[PDB]
Amino acid sequence: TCSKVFLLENEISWEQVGEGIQRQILGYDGQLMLVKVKFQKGAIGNAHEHFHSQSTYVVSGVFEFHVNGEKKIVKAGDGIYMEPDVLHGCTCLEAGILIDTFSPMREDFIN
Amino acid sequence: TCSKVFLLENEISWEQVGEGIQRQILGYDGQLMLVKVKFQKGAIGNAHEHFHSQSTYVVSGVFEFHVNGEKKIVKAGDGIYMEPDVLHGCTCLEAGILIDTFSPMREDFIN
Numbered sequence A, B: 001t002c003s004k005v006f007l008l009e010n011e012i013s014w015e016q017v018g019e020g021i022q023r024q025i026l027g028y029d030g031q032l033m034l035v036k037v038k039f040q041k042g043a044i045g046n047a048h049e050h051f052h053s054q055s056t057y058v059v060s061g062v063f064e065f066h067v068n069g070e071k072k073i074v075k076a077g078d079g080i081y082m083e084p085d086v087l088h089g090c091t092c093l094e095a096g097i098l099i100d101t102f103s104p105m106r107e108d109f110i111n
């Protein structure tokens, strides 16, 4: 239950997560999972809860993240921390990429 | 042992990791730590081992990563997975940013 050492964008498949949202599962094992998520402008990251701890990084674009109801617009270079079981989501104000990281792995992304 | 919800680049301090390497510890708890690491051209990520699982994402620039001796040049959009206790390092071929994620947290980055 792990990935290859080197995960190259041109060698990994993009998965359509939803309308305007694509993703590439990158390096992971059972305890850590790094996911690249490409958002189009207006794409909505539906609000969800999960026991997995999550730390996200904004590579590019502009997002309105909401965590536990607290809202804040975030942009490239910013990060967001989502403690276990918190309700969280996002709305892409400007097309860009998010790196979503998880502990433990999100087994539903693989299976 | 956790960070604020929203970690903004302009509100977080940059730490000089080494010659040509700066970093911002972003969202983390005890089980997951996301670190932004800004490399200058020629900067060297010294080879190290640690039981922590690590998944890295190349935001920008060009790097020669080495993992368990296997070498591969990586660029924006690529990822690298480093299993516990593997020897790994990097050399920045073009100035850019790496997102280093860890499970469990790297307590030596905080303390």
Ligand SMILES: [Zn+2]
Binding pocket: A031, A103, A104, B031, B103, B104
């Ligand atoms: Zn764990």
Ligand SMILES: [Zn+2]
Binding pocket: A048, A050, A054, A082, A088
């Ligand atoms: Zn989530």
Ligand SMILES: [Zn+2]
Binding pocket: B048, B050, B054, B082, B088
């Ligand atoms: Zn490392």
